[PDB]
Amino acid sequence: XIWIAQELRRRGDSFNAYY
Amino acid sequence: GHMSQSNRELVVDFLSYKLSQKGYSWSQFSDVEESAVKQALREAGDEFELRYRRAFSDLTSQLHITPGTAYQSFEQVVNELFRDGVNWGRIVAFFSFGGALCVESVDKEMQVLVSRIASWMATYLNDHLEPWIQENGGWDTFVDLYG
Ligand SMILES: [Cl-]
Ligand SMILES: [Cl-]
């Protein structure tokens, strides 16, 4: 995992916003 | 079909790229043998790693990965990641995650996991990501945005 999945979510979301 | 096959091939391309980038070779783990899509995905993956690699430096320890627990752990992570929706960034994180897990597995004497992870990635993409992808401009739009 939950913790890892949530790190990927926040970071994936940050990455998404950048592009 | 052509669709399912192309997604499996996209996974092979990304993982081979990532594995080779680290001194490994796809052929060492599987007998399964640049489009703008593959290029753009490799590029997005590298960008995600250049930004967050350090925080994701020890996945196998953080998740206590072992050949006997990899199957369920991988699925739980991916299910949570997309539990409330999908976006291109999360898809890139999904790929980077799988790629990083593959490298760590071989580095830590669990190379048998590379083929499994590749399949798990392709299966989840085809069954649970493809729909969102085709309803959101397809990979072509990903190329336009992250190309
Ligand atoms: Cl963290
Ligand atoms: Cl959440």
CSV table of N, CA and C and ligand atoms in Angstrom, one decimal, unseen atoms left out:
chain,number,residue,atom,x,y,z
A,1,UNK,CA,2.5,-2.8,-0.9
A,1,UNK,C,1.7,-1.5,-1.0
A,2,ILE,N,0.8,-1.2,0.0
A,2,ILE,CA,0.0,0.0,0.0
A,2,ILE,C,0.9,1.3,0.0
A,3,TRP,N,1.9,1.3,0.9
A,3,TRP,CA,2.8,2.4,1.0
A,3,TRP,C,3.5,2.7,-0.3
A,4,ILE,N,4.0,1.7,-0.9
A,4,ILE,CA,4.7,1.9,-2.2
A,4,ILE,C,3.8,2.3,-3.3
A,5,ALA,N,2.6,1.7,-3.3
A,5,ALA,CA,1.6,2.1,-4.3
A,5,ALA,C,1.3,3.6,-4.2
A,6,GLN,N,1.2,4.1,-2.9
A,6,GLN,CA,0.9,5.5,-2.7
A,6,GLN,C,2.0,6.4,-3.1
A,7,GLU,N,3.3,5.9,-3.0
A,7,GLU,CA,4.4,6.7,-3.4
A,7,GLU,C,4.3,6.9,-4.9
A,8,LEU,N,4.0,5.8,-5.6
A,8,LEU,CA,3.9,5.8,-7.0
A,8,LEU,C,2.8,6.7,-7.5
A,9,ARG,N,1.7,6.7,-6.8
A,9,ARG,CA,0.5,7.6,-7.1
A,9,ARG,C,0.9,9.0,-7.0
A,10,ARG,N,1.4,9.5,-5.9
A,10,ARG,CA,1.8,10.9,-5.7
A,10,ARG,C,2.9,11.3,-6.7
A,11,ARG,N,3.9,10.4,-6.9
A,11,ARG,CA,5.0,10.7,-7.8
A,11,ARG,C,4.5,10.6,-9.3
A,12,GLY,N,3.7,9.6,-9.6
A,12,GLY,CA,3.2,9.5,-10.9
A,12,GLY,C,2.3,10.7,-11.2
A,13,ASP,N,1.5,11.1,-10.3
A,13,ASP,CA,0.6,12.3,-10.4
A,13,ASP,C,1.5,13.5,-10.6
A,14,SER,N,2.6,13.7,-9.8
A,14,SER,CA,3.5,14.8,-10.0
A,14,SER,C,4.1,14.9,-11.4
A,15,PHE,N,4.5,13.7,-11.9
A,15,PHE,CA,5.1,13.5,-13.2
A,15,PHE,C,4.1,13.8,-14.2
A,16,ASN,N,2.8,13.4,-14.0
A,16,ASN,CA,1.7,13.6,-15.0
A,16,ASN,C,1.5,15.1,-15.2
A,17,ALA,N,1.5,15.9,-14.1
A,17,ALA,CA,1.3,17.3,-14.1
A,17,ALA,C,2.4,18.1,-14.8
A,18,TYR,N,3.6,17.6,-14.7
A,18,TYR,CA,4.7,18.2,-15.3
A,18,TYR,C,4.6,18.2,-16.9
A,19,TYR,N,3.9,17.2,-17.4
A,19,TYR,CA,3.8,17.0,-18.8
A,19,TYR,C,2.3,17.2,-19.3
B,1,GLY,N,-4.8,-11.3,-29.9
B,1,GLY,CA,-5.0,-10.4,-31.1
B,1,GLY,C,-3.8,-9.5,-31.2
B,2,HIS,N,-3.8,-8.7,-32.3
B,2,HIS,CA,-2.8,-7.7,-32.5
B,2,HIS,C,-2.6,-6.8,-31.3
B,3,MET,N,-3.7,-6.4,-30.8
B,3,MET,CA,-3.7,-5.5,-29.6
B,3,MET,C,-2.9,-6.0,-28.4
B,4,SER,N,-3.3,-7.2,-28.0
B,4,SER,CA,-2.7,-7.9,-26.8
B,4,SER,C,-1.2,-8.1,-27.1
B,5,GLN,N,-0.9,-8.5,-28.3
B,5,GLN,CA,0.4,-8.8,-28.7
B,5,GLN,C,1.3,-7.6,-28.7
B,6,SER,N,0.8,-6.5,-29.2
B,6,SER,CA,1.5,-5.2,-29.2
B,6,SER,C,1.9,-4.7,-27.8
B,7,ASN,N,0.9,-4.9,-26.8
B,7,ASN,CA,1.2,-4.5,-25.5
B,7,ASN,C,2.2,-5.4,-24.8
B,8,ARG,N,2.2,-6.7,-25.2
B,8,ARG,CA,3.2,-7.6,-24.6
B,8,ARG,C,4.6,-7.2,-25.2
B,9,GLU,N,4.6,-6.8,-26.5
B,9,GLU,CA,5.9,-6.4,-27.1
B,9,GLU,C,6.4,-5.1,-26.6
B,10,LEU,N,5.5,-4.2,-26.2
B,10,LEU,CA,5.8,-2.9,-25.6
B,10,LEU,C,6.5,-3.2,-24.2
B,11,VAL,N,6.0,-4.1,-23.5
B,11,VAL,CA,6.6,-4.5,-22.2
B,11,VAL,C,8.0,-5.0,-22.4
B,12,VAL,N,8.1,-5.9,-23.4
B,12,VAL,CA,9.4,-6.5,-23.6
B,12,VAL,C,10.5,-5.4,-24.0
B,13,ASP,N,10.0,-4.5,-24.9
B,13,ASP,CA,10.9,-3.4,-25.3
B,13,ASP,C,11.4,-2.6,-24.1
B,14,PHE,N,10.4,-2.2,-23.3
B,14,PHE,CA,10.8,-1.4,-22.1
B,14,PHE,C,11.7,-2.1,-21.2
B,15,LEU,N,11.4,-3.3,-20.8
B,15,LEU,CA,12.2,-4.0,-19.9
B,15,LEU,C,13.6,-4.4,-20.4
B,16,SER,N,13.7,-4.7,-21.7
B,16,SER,CA,14.9,-5.0,-22.4
B,16,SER,C,15.8,-3.8,-22.3
B,17,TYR,N,15.2,-2.7,-22.6
B,17,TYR,CA,15.9,-1.4,-22.6
B,17,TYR,C,16.4,-1.1,-21.2
B,18,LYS,N,15.5,-1.2,-20.2
B,18,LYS,CA,15.9,-1.0,-18.8
B,18,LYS,C,17.0,-2.0,-18.3
B,19,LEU,N,16.8,-3.2,-18.7
B,19,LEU,CA,17.7,-4.3,-18.2
B,19,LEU,C,19.1,-4.1,-18.9
B,20,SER,N,19.2,-3.7,-20.1
B,20,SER,CA,20.4,-3.5,-20.9
B,20,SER,C,21.1,-2.2,-20.3
B,21,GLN,N,20.3,-1.2,-20.0
B,21,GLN,CA,20.8,0.0,-19.4
B,21,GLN,C,21.6,-0.2,-18.1
B,22,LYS,N,21.3,-1.3,-17.5
B,22,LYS,CA,22.0,-1.7,-16.3
B,22,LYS,C,23.0,-2.8,-16.5
B,23,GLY,N,23.4,-3.1,-17.7
B,23,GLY,CA,24.4,-4.2,-18.0
B,23,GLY,C,23.8,-5.6,-18.1
B,24,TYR,N,22.5,-5.7,-18.2
B,24,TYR,CA,21.9,-7.0,-18.3
B,24,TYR,C,21.3,-7.2,-19.8
B,25,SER,N,20.8,-8.4,-20.1
B,25,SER,CA,20.3,-8.6,-21.4
B,25,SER,C,19.1,-9.5,-21.3
B,26,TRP,N,18.0,-9.1,-22.0
B,26,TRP,CA,16.7,-9.8,-22.0
B,26,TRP,C,16.8,-11.3,-22.3
B,27,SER,N,17.7,-11.6,-23.2
B,27,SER,CA,17.9,-13.0,-23.6
B,27,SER,C,18.3,-13.9,-22.5
B,28,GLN,N,18.9,-13.3,-21.5
B,28,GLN,CA,19.4,-14.0,-20.3
B,28,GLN,C,18.2,-14.5,-19.4
B,29,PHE,N,17.1,-13.9,-19.6
B,29,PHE,CA,15.9,-14.2,-18.8
B,29,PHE,C,14.7,-14.8,-19.5
B,30,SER,N,14.7,-14.6,-20.8
B,30,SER,CA,13.5,-15.1,-21.6
B,30,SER,C,13.9,-15.4,-23.1
B,31,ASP,N,13.2,-16.3,-23.6
B,31,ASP,CA,13.4,-16.7,-25.0
B,31,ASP,C,12.4,-15.9,-25.9
B,32,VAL,N,11.5,-15.1,-25.3
B,32,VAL,CA,10.6,-14.3,-26.0
B,32,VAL,C,11.4,-13.3,-26.8
B,33,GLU,N,11.3,-13.3,-28.1
B,33,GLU,CA,12.1,-12.3,-28.8
B,33,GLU,C,11.3,-11.0,-28.9
B,34,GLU,N,12.9,2.2,-33.8
B,34,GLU,CA,12.0,2.3,-32.7
B,34,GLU,C,10.7,3.0,-33.0
B,35,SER,N,9.6,2.3,-32.7
B,35,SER,CA,8.3,3.0,-32.9
B,35,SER,C,8.3,4.2,-32.0
B,36,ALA,N,7.6,5.2,-32.3
B,36,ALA,CA,7.5,6.4,-31.5
B,36,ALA,C,7.0,6.1,-30.1
B,37,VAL,N,6.1,5.1,-30.0
B,37,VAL,CA,5.6,4.8,-28.7
B,37,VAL,C,6.6,4.2,-27.8
B,38,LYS,N,7.4,3.2,-28.3
B,38,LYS,CA,8.5,2.6,-27.5
B,38,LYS,C,9.5,3.6,-27.1
B,39,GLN,N,9.9,4.5,-28.0
B,39,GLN,CA,10.8,5.6,-27.7
B,39,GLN,C,10.4,6.5,-26.6
B,40,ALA,N,9.1,6.9,-26.8
B,40,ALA,CA,8.5,7.8,-25.8
B,40,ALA,C,8.4,7.2,-24.4
B,41,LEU,N,8.1,5.9,-24.4
B,41,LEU,CA,8.0,5.2,-23.1
B,41,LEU,C,9.3,5.0,-22.4
B,42,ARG,N,10.4,4.7,-23.2
B,42,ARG,CA,11.7,4.5,-22.6
B,42,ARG,C,12.1,5.9,-22.0
B,43,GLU,N,11.9,6.9,-22.8
B,43,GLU,CA,12.2,8.3,-22.4
B,43,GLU,C,11.5,8.7,-21.1
B,44,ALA,N,10.2,8.5,-21.0
B,44,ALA,CA,9.4,8.8,-19.8
B,44,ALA,C,10.0,8.1,-18.7
B,45,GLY,N,10.2,6.8,-18.9
B,45,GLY,CA,10.7,5.9,-17.8
B,45,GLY,C,12.0,6.5,-17.3
B,46,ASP,N,13.0,6.8,-18.2
B,46,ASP,CA,14.2,7.4,-17.7
B,46,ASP,C,14.0,8.6,-16.9
B,47,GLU,N,13.1,9.5,-17.4
B,47,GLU,CA,12.8,10.7,-16.7
B,47,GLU,C,12.3,10.5,-15.3
B,48,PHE,N,11.4,9.5,-15.2
B,48,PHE,CA,10.9,9.2,-13.9
B,48,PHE,C,12.0,8.7,-12.9
B,49,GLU,N,12.8,7.9,-13.5
B,49,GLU,CA,13.9,7.3,-12.7
B,49,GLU,C,14.9,8.4,-12.2
B,50,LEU,N,15.3,9.3,-13.2
B,50,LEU,CA,16.2,10.4,-12.9
B,50,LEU,C,15.7,11.2,-11.7
B,51,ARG,N,14.4,11.3,-11.6
B,51,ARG,CA,13.7,12.1,-10.6
B,51,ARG,C,13.5,11.3,-9.2
B,52,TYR,N,13.1,10.1,-9.3
B,52,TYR,CA,12.8,9.4,-8.1
B,52,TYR,C,13.6,8.1,-7.8
B,53,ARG,N,14.6,7.7,-8.6
B,53,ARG,CA,15.3,6.5,-8.3
B,53,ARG,C,15.8,6.3,-6.9
B,54,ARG,N,16.4,7.3,-6.3
B,54,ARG,CA,16.8,7.2,-4.9
B,54,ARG,C,15.8,6.8,-3.9
B,55,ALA,N,14.6,7.4,-4.0
B,55,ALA,CA,13.5,7.0,-3.1
B,55,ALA,C,13.0,5.6,-3.3
B,56,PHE,N,13.3,5.0,-4.5
B,56,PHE,CA,12.8,3.7,-4.9
B,56,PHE,C,14.1,2.8,-5.0
B,57,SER,N,15.1,3.1,-4.3
B,57,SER,CA,16.4,2.3,-4.5
B,57,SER,C,16.4,0.9,-3.9
B,58,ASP,N,15.5,0.5,-3.0
B,58,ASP,CA,15.6,-0.8,-2.4
B,58,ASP,C,14.2,-1.4,-2.3
B,59,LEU,N,13.5,-1.6,-3.5
B,59,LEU,CA,12.2,-2.2,-3.6
B,59,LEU,C,12.0,-3.6,-2.9
B,60,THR,N,13.0,-4.5,-3.2
B,60,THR,CA,12.9,-5.8,-2.7
B,60,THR,C,12.9,-5.9,-1.2
B,61,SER,N,13.6,-5.0,-0.5
B,61,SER,CA,13.7,-5.0,0.9
B,61,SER,C,12.5,-4.3,1.5
B,62,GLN,N,12.1,-3.2,0.8
B,62,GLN,CA,10.9,-2.5,1.3
B,62,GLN,C,9.7,-3.4,1.2
B,63,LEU,N,9.6,-4.2,0.2
B,63,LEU,CA,8.5,-5.1,0.0
B,63,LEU,C,8.7,-6.5,0.4
B,64,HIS,N,10.0,-6.8,0.9
B,64,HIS,CA,10.3,-8.1,1.4
B,64,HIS,C,10.1,-9.2,0.3
B,65,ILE,N,10.5,-8.8,-0.9
B,65,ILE,CA,10.4,-9.7,-2.1
B,65,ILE,C,11.1,-11.0,-2.0
B,66,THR,N,10.4,-12.1,-2.4
B,66,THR,CA,11.0,-13.4,-2.4
B,66,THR,C,10.2,-14.1,-3.5
B,67,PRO,N,10.8,-15.1,-4.2
B,67,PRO,CA,10.0,-15.8,-5.2
B,67,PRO,C,8.6,-16.2,-4.8
B,68,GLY,N,8.5,-16.5,-3.5
B,68,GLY,CA,7.2,-17.0,-3.0
B,68,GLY,C,6.2,-15.9,-2.7
B,69,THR,N,6.6,-14.6,-2.6
B,69,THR,CA,5.7,-13.5,-2.3
B,69,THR,C,5.6,-12.5,-3.4
B,70,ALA,N,6.4,-12.6,-4.4
B,70,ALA,CA,6.4,-11.6,-5.5
B,70,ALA,C,5.0,-11.5,-6.2
B,71,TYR,N,4.4,-12.6,-6.5
B,71,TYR,CA,3.2,-12.6,-7.2
B,71,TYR,C,2.1,-11.8,-6.6
B,72,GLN,N,1.8,-12.0,-5.3
B,72,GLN,CA,0.8,-11.2,-4.6
B,72,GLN,C,1.2,-9.8,-4.3
B,73,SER,N,2.4,-9.6,-4.0
B,73,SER,CA,2.9,-8.2,-3.7
B,73,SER,C,2.8,-7.3,-4.9
B,74,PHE,N,3.2,-7.8,-6.0
B,74,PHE,CA,3.2,-7.0,-7.3
B,74,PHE,C,1.7,-6.6,-7.6
B,75,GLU,N,0.8,-7.6,-7.5
B,75,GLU,CA,-0.6,-7.3,-7.8
B,75,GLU,C,-1.2,-6.3,-6.8
B,76,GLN,N,-0.9,-6.4,-5.6
B,76,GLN,CA,-1.4,-5.5,-4.5
B,76,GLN,C,-1.0,-4.1,-4.8
B,77,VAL,N,0.3,-3.9,-5.2
B,77,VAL,CA,0.8,-2.6,-5.5
B,77,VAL,C,0.1,-1.9,-6.7
B,78,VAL,N,0.0,-2.7,-7.7
B,78,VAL,CA,-0.6,-2.2,-9.0
B,78,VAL,C,-2.1,-1.9,-8.8
B,79,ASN,N,-2.8,-2.8,-8.0
B,79,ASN,CA,-4.2,-2.5,-7.8
B,79,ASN,C,-4.4,-1.2,-7.0
B,80,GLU,N,-3.5,-1.0,-6.0
B,80,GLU,CA,-3.7,0.2,-5.2
B,80,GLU,C,-3.3,1.5,-6.0
B,81,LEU,N,-2.3,1.4,-6.8
B,81,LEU,CA,-1.9,2.5,-7.7
B,81,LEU,C,-3.0,3.0,-8.6
B,82,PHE,N,-3.8,2.1,-9.1
B,82,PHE,CA,-4.9,2.5,-10.0
B,82,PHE,C,-6.3,2.3,-9.4
B,83,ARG,N,-6.4,2.2,-8.1
B,83,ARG,CA,-7.7,1.9,-7.5
B,83,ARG,C,-8.7,2.9,-7.8
B,84,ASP,N,-8.4,4.2,-7.9
B,84,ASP,CA,-9.4,5.2,-8.2
B,84,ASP,C,-9.3,5.9,-9.5
B,85,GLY,N,-8.5,5.4,-10.4
B,85,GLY,CA,-8.4,6.0,-11.7
B,85,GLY,C,-7.0,5.9,-12.4
B,86,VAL,N,-6.9,6.4,-13.6
B,86,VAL,CA,-5.6,6.3,-14.3
B,86,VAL,C,-5.3,7.6,-15.0
B,87,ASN,N,-4.0,7.8,-15.2
B,87,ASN,CA,-3.4,9.0,-15.9
B,87,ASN,C,-2.1,8.5,-16.5
B,88,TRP,N,-1.5,9.2,-17.4
B,88,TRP,CA,-0.3,8.8,-18.1
B,88,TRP,C,0.9,8.7,-17.1
B,89,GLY,N,0.9,9.7,-16.1
B,89,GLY,CA,2.0,9.6,-15.1
B,89,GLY,C,2.0,8.4,-14.3
B,90,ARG,N,0.9,7.9,-13.9
B,90,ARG,CA,0.8,6.7,-13.1
B,90,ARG,C,1.2,5.5,-14.0
B,91,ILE,N,0.9,5.5,-15.3
B,91,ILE,CA,1.2,4.5,-16.2
B,91,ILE,C,2.8,4.4,-16.3
B,92,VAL,N,3.4,5.6,-16.3
B,92,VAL,CA,4.9,5.6,-16.4
B,92,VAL,C,5.5,5.1,-15.1
B,93,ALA,N,4.8,5.4,-13.9
B,93,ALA,CA,5.3,4.9,-12.6
B,93,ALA,C,5.2,3.4,-12.6
B,94,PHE,N,4.1,2.9,-13.2
B,94,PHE,CA,3.8,1.5,-13.2
B,94,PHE,C,5.0,0.8,-14.0
B,95,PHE,N,5.3,1.3,-15.1
B,95,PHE,CA,6.4,0.8,-15.9
B,95,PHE,C,7.8,0.8,-15.2
B,96,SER,N,8.1,2.0,-14.7
B,96,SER,CA,9.4,2.2,-14.0
B,96,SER,C,9.5,1.3,-12.8
B,97,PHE,N,8.3,1.1,-12.1
B,97,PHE,CA,8.3,0.2,-10.9
B,97,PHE,C,8.6,-1.2,-11.4
B,98,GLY,N,7.9,-1.7,-12.4
B,98,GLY,CA,8.2,-3.0,-12.9
B,98,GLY,C,9.6,-3.2,-13.4
B,99,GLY,N,10.1,-2.2,-14.1
B,99,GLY,CA,11.5,-2.2,-14.6
B,99,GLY,C,12.5,-2.3,-13.5
B,100,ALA,N,12.3,-1.4,-12.5
B,100,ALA,CA,13.2,-1.4,-11.3
B,100,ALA,C,13.2,-2.7,-10.6
B,101,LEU,N,12.0,-3.3,-10.4
B,101,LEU,CA,11.8,-4.5,-9.7
B,101,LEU,C,12.5,-5.6,-10.5
B,102,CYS,N,12.5,-5.6,-11.8
B,102,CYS,CA,13.2,-6.6,-12.6
B,102,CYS,C,14.7,-6.5,-12.4
B,103,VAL,N,15.3,-5.3,-12.4
B,103,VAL,CA,16.7,-5.2,-12.2
B,103,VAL,C,17.2,-5.7,-10.8
B,104,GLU,N,16.5,-5.2,-9.8
B,104,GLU,CA,16.8,-5.6,-8.4
B,104,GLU,C,16.7,-7.1,-8.3
B,105,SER,N,15.7,-7.7,-8.9
B,105,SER,CA,15.5,-9.2,-8.7
B,105,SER,C,16.7,-9.9,-9.2
B,106,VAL,N,17.3,-9.6,-10.4
B,106,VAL,CA,18.4,-10.3,-10.9
B,106,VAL,C,19.7,-9.9,-10.1
B,107,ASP,N,19.7,-8.7,-9.6
B,107,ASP,CA,20.9,-8.3,-8.8
B,107,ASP,C,20.9,-9.0,-7.5
B,108,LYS,N,19.7,-9.4,-7.1
B,108,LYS,CA,19.6,-10.2,-5.8
B,108,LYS,C,19.2,-11.6,-6.0
B,109,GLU,N,19.8,-12.3,-7.0
B,109,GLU,CA,19.6,-13.7,-7.3
B,109,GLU,C,18.2,-14.2,-7.3
B,110,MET,N,17.3,-13.5,-8.0
B,110,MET,CA,15.9,-13.9,-8.2
B,110,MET,C,15.5,-13.6,-9.6
B,111,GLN,N,16.5,-13.9,-10.5
B,111,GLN,CA,16.2,-13.6,-11.9
B,111,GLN,C,15.0,-14.3,-12.5
B,112,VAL,N,14.6,-15.4,-11.8
B,112,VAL,CA,13.4,-16.2,-12.3
B,112,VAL,C,12.2,-15.2,-12.3
B,113,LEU,N,12.3,-14.1,-11.6
B,113,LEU,CA,11.1,-13.2,-11.5
B,113,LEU,C,11.0,-12.3,-12.7
B,114,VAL,N,12.0,-12.1,-13.5
B,114,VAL,CA,12.0,-11.2,-14.7
B,114,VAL,C,10.9,-11.6,-15.6
B,115,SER,N,10.8,-12.8,-16.0
B,115,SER,CA,9.8,-13.3,-17.0
B,115,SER,C,8.4,-13.1,-16.4
B,116,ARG,N,8.2,-13.5,-15.1
B,116,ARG,CA,7.0,-13.4,-14.4
B,116,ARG,C,6.5,-11.9,-14.4
B,117,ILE,N,7.3,-11.0,-13.9
B,117,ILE,CA,7.0,-9.6,-13.9
B,117,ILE,C,6.6,-9.1,-15.2
B,118,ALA,N,7.4,-9.5,-16.3
B,118,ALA,CA,7.1,-9.0,-17.6
B,118,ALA,C,5.6,-9.4,-18.0
B,119,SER,N,5.3,-10.7,-17.7
B,119,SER,CA,4.0,-11.2,-18.0
B,119,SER,C,2.9,-10.4,-17.2
B,120,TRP,N,3.2,-10.3,-15.9
B,120,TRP,CA,2.3,-9.6,-15.0
B,120,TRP,C,2.0,-8.2,-15.5
B,121,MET,N,3.0,-7.5,-15.9
B,121,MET,CA,2.9,-6.1,-16.4
B,121,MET,C,2.0,-6.1,-17.7
B,122,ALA,N,2.4,-7.0,-18.6
B,122,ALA,CA,1.6,-7.0,-19.9
B,122,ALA,C,0.2,-7.4,-19.6
B,123,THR,N,-0.1,-8.4,-18.7
B,123,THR,CA,-1.4,-8.8,-18.5
B,123,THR,C,-2.3,-7.7,-17.9
B,124,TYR,N,-1.7,-7.0,-16.9
B,124,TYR,CA,-2.4,-5.9,-16.2
B,124,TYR,C,-2.7,-4.8,-17.2
B,125,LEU,N,-1.7,-4.5,-18.1
B,125,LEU,CA,-1.8,-3.4,-19.1
B,125,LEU,C,-3.0,-3.8,-20.0
B,126,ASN,N,-3.0,-5.0,-20.6
B,126,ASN,CA,-4.0,-5.4,-21.5
B,126,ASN,C,-5.4,-5.5,-20.9
B,127,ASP,N,-5.5,-6.0,-19.6
B,127,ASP,CA,-6.8,-6.2,-19.0
B,127,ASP,C,-7.3,-5.0,-18.2
B,128,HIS,N,-6.4,-4.2,-17.6
B,128,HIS,CA,-6.9,-3.0,-16.8
B,128,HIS,C,-6.4,-1.6,-17.2
B,129,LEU,N,-5.6,-1.5,-18.2
B,129,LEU,CA,-5.0,-0.2,-18.6
B,129,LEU,C,-5.5,0.2,-20.0
B,130,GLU,N,-5.4,-0.8,-20.9
B,130,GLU,CA,-5.8,-0.7,-22.3
B,130,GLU,C,-7.1,0.1,-22.5
B,131,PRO,N,-8.1,-0.2,-21.7
B,131,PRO,CA,-9.4,0.4,-21.9
B,131,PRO,C,-9.3,2.0,-21.7
B,132,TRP,N,-8.6,2.4,-20.6
B,132,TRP,CA,-8.4,3.8,-20.3
B,132,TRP,C,-7.6,4.4,-21.4
B,133,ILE,N,-6.6,3.7,-21.8
B,133,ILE,CA,-5.7,4.2,-22.9
B,133,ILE,C,-6.4,4.4,-24.2
B,134,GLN,N,-7.3,3.5,-24.6
B,134,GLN,CA,-8.0,3.7,-25.9
B,134,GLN,C,-9.1,4.8,-25.8
B,135,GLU,N,-9.5,5.1,-24.6
B,135,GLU,CA,-10.6,6.1,-24.4
B,135,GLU,C,-9.9,7.4,-24.1
B,136,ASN,N,-8.6,7.5,-24.0
B,136,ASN,CA,-7.9,8.7,-23.7
B,136,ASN,C,-6.9,9.1,-24.8
B,137,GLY,N,-7.2,8.8,-26.0
B,137,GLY,CA,-6.3,9.2,-27.1
B,137,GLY,C,-5.3,8.1,-27.5
B,138,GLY,N,-5.3,6.9,-26.8
B,138,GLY,CA,-4.3,5.9,-27.2
B,138,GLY,C,-2.9,6.3,-27.0
B,139,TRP,N,-2.0,5.3,-27.2
B,139,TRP,CA,-0.6,5.6,-27.1
B,139,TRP,C,-0.1,6.8,-27.9
B,140,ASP,N,-0.7,7.0,-29.0
B,140,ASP,CA,-0.3,8.2,-29.9
B,140,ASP,C,-0.4,9.5,-29.1
B,141,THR,N,-1.4,9.6,-28.3
B,141,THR,CA,-1.6,10.8,-27.5
B,141,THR,C,-0.5,10.9,-26.4
B,142,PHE,N,-0.1,9.7,-25.9
B,142,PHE,CA,1.0,9.6,-24.9
B,142,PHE,C,2.3,10.2,-25.6
B,143,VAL,N,2.5,9.8,-26.8
B,143,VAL,CA,3.7,10.2,-27.6
B,143,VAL,C,3.6,11.7,-27.8
B,144,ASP,N,2.4,12.3,-28.1
B,144,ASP,CA,2.3,13.7,-28.3
B,144,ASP,C,2.6,14.5,-27.0
B,145,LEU,N,2.2,13.9,-25.8
B,145,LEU,CA,2.5,14.5,-24.5
B,145,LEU,C,3.8,14.3,-23.9
B,146,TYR,N,4.4,13.1,-24.0
B,146,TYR,CA,5.7,12.8,-23.4
B,146,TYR,C,6.7,12.4,-24.5
B,147,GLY,N,6.3,12.3,-25.7
B,147,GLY,CA,7.2,12.0,-26.8
B,147,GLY,C,8.7,12.4,-26.7
C,1,CL,CL,9.6,7.7,-0.1
C,2,CL,CL,-6.0,6.9,-2.2
